[PDB]
Design a protein around this nucleic acid. Structure first.
Ligand code: ZN
Ligand code: ZN
Ligand code: ZN
Lengths: 120, 120
DNA sequence: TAATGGGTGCACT
DNA sequence: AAGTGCACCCATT
């Protein structure tokens, strides 16, 4: 159980996924929304994996809490196959639109390394 | 396996549910969409597991929709009175008024009237 | 958005 | 009767 800290001051819950993607895409993890509402978003691996990420707003702390549950995946983590999905390409395009040069560089290198079949 | 006839000339998957509601609501059957795509819609009983299934499929060859009822057996009682208290029925009823479906409105008015009087 | 658990309709894929 | 991503819900404390 991992309590992420610190967490950005999200203005919209829809800022959460892209932020988690930057973190987990490099790990070869491809997160999707299992459930969401105004005050929570729960993530799992894209399709029987027990890996979970629970984001929920805390009134007491006036912030979003993000907790990582159960790191043990029931599958292989392969970043190479991830770069082919549509969610990844949109994530990548989003990075550019937000002019996140640092992240953009990180993923260009990751993609290049992957194209060389180097361990990830 | 029961084929329904006659079937109106639907021009969109989304026109099918409202038609099916007019037919099955009076039978104490509350249909929901299990799944849909541009050429197929699968319906079942709202979850309140029941095997009952309705499948509407578009024949490209015949350029018409065919509707079939499967597993006509239910795992639950069929109560119209309970149905009338749901949000989807109320929305269904308002849709009839929107469409100026005078005859349908009359029909369901009587069904509700009899329902309120505990009349079977 | 009390905190925290889960249900399920349904269109996308 | 495609499987599942996602969000509109509800339940219990
Ligand atoms: Zn939003
Ligand atoms: Zn996983
Ligand atoms: Zn049923």
């Amino acid at each position: 159980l991992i309590h992420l800290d610190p967490v950005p001051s999200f203005e919209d819950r829809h800022e959460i996924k892209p932020w988690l993607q930057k973190i987990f895409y490099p790990q070869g993890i491809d997160i999707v929304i299992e459930r969401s509402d105004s005050s929570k978003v729960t993530f799992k691996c894209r399709s029987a994996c027990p890996f979970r990420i629970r984001a929920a707003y805390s009134v007491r702390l006036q912030k979003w809490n993000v907790v990582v549950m159960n790191n043990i995946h029931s599958h292989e983590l392969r970043f190479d196959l991830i770069t082919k999905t549509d969610d990844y390409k949109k994530f990548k395009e989003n990075l550019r639109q937000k002019n996140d040069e640092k992240a953009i560089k990180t993923f260009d290198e990751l993609e290049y390394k992957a194209s060389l079949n180097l361990p990830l």
